[PDB]
Design an enzyme around this catalytic site. Structure first.
Site, PDB file in Angstrom:
ATOM      1  N   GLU A  35       0.847  -1.250  -0.220  1.00 49.59           N
ATOM      2  CA  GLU A  35      -0.026  -0.277   0.081  1.00 49.59           C
ATOM      3  C   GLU A  35       1.022   1.260  -0.437  1.00 49.59           C
ATOM      4  O   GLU A  35       0.205   2.420  -0.422  1.00 49.59           O
ATOM      5  CB  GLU A  35      -1.349  -0.381   1.316  1.00 49.59           C
ATOM      6  N   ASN A  46      -6.931  11.213  -5.855  1.00 49.21           N
ATOM      7  CA  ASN A  46      -7.654  10.727  -6.379  1.00 49.21           C
ATOM      8  C   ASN A  46      -8.348  11.318  -7.453  1.00 49.21           C
ATOM      9  O   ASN A  46      -8.852  12.481  -6.613  1.00 49.21           O
ATOM     10  CB  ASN A  46      -7.964   9.257  -5.600  1.00 49.21           C
ATOM     11  N   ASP A  48     -11.615  11.208  -8.009  1.00 46.47           N
ATOM     12  CA  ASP A  48     -12.874  10.707  -7.535  1.00 46.47           C
ATOM     13  C   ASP A  48     -13.004  11.219  -6.759  1.00 46.47           C
ATOM     14  O   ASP A  48     -14.111  11.356  -5.653  1.00 46.47           O
ATOM     15  CB  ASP A  48     -13.200   9.423  -7.437  1.00 46.47           C
ATOM     16  N   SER A  50     -12.111  11.661  -2.920  1.00 47.31           N
ATOM     17  CA  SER A  50     -10.714  10.883  -2.200  1.00 47.31           C
ATOM     18  C   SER A  50      -9.394  10.736  -2.259  1.00 47.31           C
ATOM     19  O   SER A  50      -8.541  10.891  -3.565  1.00 47.31           O
ATOM     20  CB  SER A  50     -11.721  10.430  -1.990  1.00 47.31           C
ATOM     21  N   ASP A  52      -6.621   8.390  -0.350  1.00 48.35           N
ATOM     22  CA  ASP A  52      -6.099   7.605   0.808  1.00 48.35           C
ATOM     23  C   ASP A  52      -4.766   7.935   1.508  1.00 48.35           C
ATOM     24  O   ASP A  52      -3.516   8.666   1.049  1.00 48.35           O
ATOM     25  CB  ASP A  52      -5.310   6.286  -0.739  1.00 48.35           C
ATOM     26  N   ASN A  59      -9.053   5.075   3.093  1.00 51.13           N
ATOM     27  CA  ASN A  59      -9.699   6.179   1.851  1.00 51.13           C
ATOM     28  C   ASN A  59     -10.508   6.884   2.653  1.00 51.13           C
ATOM     29  O   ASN A  59     -12.049   6.216   3.615  1.00 51.13           O
ATOM     30  CB  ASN A  59     -10.272   5.166   0.929  1.00 51.13           C
TER      31      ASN A  59
END
Ligand SMILES: [Pt+2]
Ligand SMILES: [Pt+2]
EC number: 3.2.1.17
Length: 129
Positions: A35, A46, A48, A50, A52, A59
């Site tokens: 990760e 991201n 979208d 969001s 991480d 997220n």
């Protein structure tokens, strides 16, 4: 902070991850490796809306609140910045909540794709403990 694998194993073990919901310690260390490369400060912003966050790349849509993500649920009840701490406790606690909220380790794409069904014990092999 960028952890070593054995140091991260020991910290995760102190926080009860070995065999948490039937997932051995090596699974958790492997998930962190793929990760975040063991980097507590890792972020992936991201398209979208969001982001991480942290060593386990948690997220901001469902799990932590960054204030700026549409559809926020904040199921871990924490600001996402808490997941960028040098100590791993908030990330461990939120990871436990992720599993407790109906998920396996399948919730982490890097786990499914890079740890699932491999020699995950390689990530703790030769570590003091
Ligand atoms: Pt750091
Ligand atoms: Pt803990």
């Amino acid at each position: 902070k960028v952890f070593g694998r054995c140091e991260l194993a020991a910290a995760m073990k102190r926080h009860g991850l070995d065999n948490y919901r039937g997932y051995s310690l090596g699974n958790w260390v492997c998930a962190a490796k793929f990760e975040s490369n063991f980097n507590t400060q890792a972020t992936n912003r991201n398209t979208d809306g969001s982001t991480d966050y942290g060593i386990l790349q948690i997220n901001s849509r469902w799990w932590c609140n960054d204030g700026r993500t549409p559809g926020s649920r904040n199921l871990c009840n924490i600001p996402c910045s808490a997941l960028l701490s040098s100590d791993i406790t908030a990330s461990v606690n939120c990871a436990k909540k992720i599993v407790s909220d109906g998920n396996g380790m399948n919730a982490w794409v890097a786990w499914r794709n890079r740890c699932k069904g491999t020699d995950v014990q390689a990530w703790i092999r030769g570590c003091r403990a």
